[PDB]
Amino acid sequence: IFSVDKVRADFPVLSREVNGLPLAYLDSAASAQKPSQVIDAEAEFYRHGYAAVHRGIHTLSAQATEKMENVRKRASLFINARSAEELVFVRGTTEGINLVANSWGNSNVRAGDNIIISQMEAHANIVPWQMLCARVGAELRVIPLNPDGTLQLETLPTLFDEKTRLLAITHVSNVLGTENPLAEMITLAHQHGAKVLVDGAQAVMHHPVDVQALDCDFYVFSGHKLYGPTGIGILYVKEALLQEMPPWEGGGSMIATVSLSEGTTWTKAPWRFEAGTPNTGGIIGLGAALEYVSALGLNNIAEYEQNLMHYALSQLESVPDLTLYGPQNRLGVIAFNLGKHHAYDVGSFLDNYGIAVRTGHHCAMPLMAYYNVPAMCRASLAMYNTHEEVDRLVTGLQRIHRLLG
Amino acid sequence: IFSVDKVRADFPVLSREVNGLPLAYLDSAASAQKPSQVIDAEAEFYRHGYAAVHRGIHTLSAQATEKMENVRKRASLFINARSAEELVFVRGTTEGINLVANSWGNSNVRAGDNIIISQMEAHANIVPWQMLCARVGAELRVIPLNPDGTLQLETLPTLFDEKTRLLAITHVSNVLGTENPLAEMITLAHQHGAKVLVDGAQAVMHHPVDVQALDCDFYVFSGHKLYGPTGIGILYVKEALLQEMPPWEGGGSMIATVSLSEGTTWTKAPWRFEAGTPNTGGIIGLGAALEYVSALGLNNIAEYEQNLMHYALSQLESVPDLTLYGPQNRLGVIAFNLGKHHAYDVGSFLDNYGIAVRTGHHCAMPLMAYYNVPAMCRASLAMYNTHEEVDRLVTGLQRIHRLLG
Ligand SMILES: *Cc1c(COP(=O)(O)O)cnc(C)c1O
Ligand SMILES: *Cc1c(COP(=O)(O)O)cnc(C)c1O
Ligand SMILES: [Cl-]
Ligand SMILES: [Cl-]
Known part of the structure; x- marks a missing residue:
């Protein structure tokens, strides 16, 4: 105890x-x-093992690259994802939702479609969808609240139809502490061929989370709310969806080949979604945060x-x-x-x-x-x-x- | 000495x-x-002063918010920007170039226009422009190299025309160590009404940099190459341009009002470009890195x-x-x-x-x-x-x- x-x-x-x-x-x-334990894990990395992490030849860089991919695996076991390659390192929940809204949203939401959010969402899980709807000409639908701070689930029949492409829903409200009935809502969304993104930034520190049991398509959370450093978060995406998603940010380390005459090709997921130097210090600290929470x-x-x-x-x-x-x-x-x-x-x-x-x-x-x-x-x-x-x-x-x- | x-x-x-x-x-x-000095500045922040930084009411959050805006001002003096509000915190050079390519590029580069890069650019300063050109139907032109690793400046007359909207150019090559003649190239670009983004990730640790003297429109660099932590960088943008640029990432802290029936409005720059929880630990460490370098x-x-x-x-x-x-x-x-x-x-x-x-x-x-x-x-x-x-x-x-x- x-x-x-x-x-x-x-x-x-x-x-x-x-x-x-x-x-x-x-x-x-x-x-x-x-x-x-988290503060010192980051500090000790900077003090004794620091290097760039793009499977560099020399020892410090090879070891740093391995520490980073070890944290990716530890994170995947923490949320019970089936594979470590289903996790993308992002700056936080907000950036992860923007990544999905652009890479997946732009390719799968068309003029005349609709997206469903809830009236209790944080701005992180509202604004990127408003921007997507304005980009492609889709409609943003809202599950309303009851006076006690729970969702009016009776309105779902009027909100879900053939054109609903996505439900974006919070796991636990950052204001009310309401925990939403995600598993049942995801079953309903999937019956219409809609995907489900879950904002889990307020859930992952309070009880176990299991994305295979939830069956969500996307799941995001932030390190700094999980007793970890700032500047780092996790985006989980089902492998079959992630493998089809185009890149968002472009640059080094997400390419396979770059040519100025024959164009550029992309590497495999999840690395296709991680451009430039990763936040290696944040990743080290996040890994220590997961170990600390799991030990308790x-x-x-x-x-x-x-x-x-x-x-x-x-x-x-x-x-x-x-x-x-x-x-x-x-x-x-x-x-x-x-x-x-x-x-x-x-x-x-x-x-x-x-x-x-x-x-x-x-x-x-x-x-x-x-x-x-x-x-x-x-x-x-x-x-x-x-x-x-x-x-x-x-x-x-x-x-x-x-x-x- | x-x-x-x-x-x-x-x-x-x-x-x-x-x-x-x-x-x-x-x-x-x-x-x-x-x-x-950099490692301990970050560690001590986490140990004694940590809080969320959105001008929160309570003491730790108000003090953290002030530390962050103090680093923004210190960074602006380091590169001699005219105003602290011309600097945006990004994850690094790569993210900063992607921010410009989407927020500025999408609003100012049209089908039939052209963008100019150099053959010595890093992928960070190539791929986002290839993606922009494919999005809007513009052409990517290339300044070629001489055998000694310098630019073939004699080709500039054939590359700049009425439709050239942007020159994106490295300050110092990350491979060759070539330093490009930025001030003269920027004068030429401005004669055609083109803007200039400078990739300064390899310049800011070797000698003073002065963006007013350069007169560049955009300037980017990364903290982790400036003896600082990972996960943090700086994008400088001329105030007149930045004030007209639309947001890129959406979410908390970059809005003025959010409404599900009357839409959303944005706050002022630079905060309009910083969505979600900033990388406060990285920012603290970057500030210490600038102080350390300036003291030497x-x-x-x-x-x-x-x-x-x-x-x-x-x-x-x-x-x-x-x-x-x-x-x-x-x-x-x-x-x-x-x-x-x-x-x-x-x-x-x-x-x-x-x-x-x-x-x-x-x-x-x-x-x-x-x-x-x-x-x-x-x-x-x-x-x-x-x-x-x-x-x-x-x-x-x-x-x-x-x-x-
Ligand atoms: C390393 C470097 C970059 C990439 O910077 P990141 O911090 O990895 O985003 C871009 N341009 C040049 C010239 C560099 O040296
Ligand atoms: C705080 C929070 C966010 C924002 O996370 P960031 O780390 O700031 O990007 C999003 N959703 C919920 C429910 C949150 O509590
Ligand atoms: Cl690369
Ligand atoms: Cl807000």
């Missing part, structure tokens, strides 16, 4: 003080703190996090005029507003107590408009957060209510 | 042993080793490197059957083949002596075809390399010639 005290000892930032007070970092959903055990993480979440929700019942958004069985995050005070003010008072929460629209403006608010507060309850930090949040909201009420 | 011994003491990898022998790292042109002094670096290069070229005269490629006044790199032995074999013997050189086509196949070889060796002579390392290279080539001749 899990011991939050030993876990916290791996995270140096958690010793930090903010505004003279001990930091309570409740913003992991915006980005996760990193353990020293995602089912142990899930169990501790669910207990912490149940504790928080129970304690927050004693905050007057607190509005919560989303379902009772939320994962990871609690979205809320305090009476009629603006989220910006509530977040500033919490920061002044040393408590980091996120405020604003959370890169989900359509979700804010559904609830008819301009902004919300969001507290993240991650694997290194404690009952004590929950108590500080509850007390701070109580103090803020008294002071400003 | 410069002291190579004190500089080398900052680079931990240089203590390394390869194949039981002390490493002589002569492959900085593929990627540079990093000083501990690029004119001091240039002076030491030119002396080392003159020494190497003089010593290599005693290697039998050595073919050199490129001009006598090369910067940074020496391209060579040894008699009729394949570069791959020569590089393997050098690696076996602990000497790291690069072999192959160096992501410049058209350049290899111009010289009618399949591959070359390339030794990089950077600011932390020594006369002793040159002597080891010369001796190794002599031994290899005797053994295999």
